[PDB]
């Protein structure tokens, strides 16, 4: 994140691992 379509797929990968809907992870990571 600190470095587009790639980054969306990366959040999809994290979401598929953790079993969280991608929006929450995206928001949390963006806010941090």
Partner 1 sequence: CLDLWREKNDRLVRQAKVAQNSGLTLRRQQLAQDALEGLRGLLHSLQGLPAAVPVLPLELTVTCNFIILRASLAQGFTEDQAQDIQRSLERVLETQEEQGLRELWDSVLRASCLLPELLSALHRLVGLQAALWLSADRLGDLALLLETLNGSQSGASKDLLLLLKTWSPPAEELDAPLTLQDAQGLKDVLLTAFAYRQGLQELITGNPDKALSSLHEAASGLCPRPVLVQVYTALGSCHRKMGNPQRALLYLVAALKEGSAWGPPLLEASRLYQQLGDTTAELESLELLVEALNVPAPQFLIEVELLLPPPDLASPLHCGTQSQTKHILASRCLQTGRAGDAAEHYLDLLALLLDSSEPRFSPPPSPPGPCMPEVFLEAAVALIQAGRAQDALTLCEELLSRTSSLLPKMSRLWEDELPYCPLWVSATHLLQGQAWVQLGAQKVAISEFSRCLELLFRATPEEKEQGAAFNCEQGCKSDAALQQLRAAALISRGLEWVASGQDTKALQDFLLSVQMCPGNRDTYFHLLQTLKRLDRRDEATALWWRLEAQTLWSLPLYLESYLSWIRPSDRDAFLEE
Interaction pattern, residues 4-23, with partner 1; x per rule: CB under 8 A: --x---x-------------
Residue labelled with tokens 């990366």 = 10
For residues 19 and 2, what is the distance between their CA atoms, to the nearest angstrom?
24
Contact between residue 2 and residue 16 where contact means Cβ atoms under 8 Å apart: no
For residues 14 and 21, what is the distance between their CA atoms, to the nearest angstrom?
10
Smallest separation, CB 1 to partner 1 (Å)? 9
Nearer CB in complex with partner 1: 3/21 = 3
Q: How many chain residues interact with partner 1 (CB under 8 A)?
A: 3
| Residues forming the site for partner 1 (CB under 8 A) | 3, 6, 10
């Amino acid at each position: 994140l600190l470095e587009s379509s790639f980054i969306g797929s990366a959040l999809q990968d994290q979401a598929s691992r953790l079993g969280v809907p991608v929006g929450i992870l995206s928001a949390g990571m963006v806010a941090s």
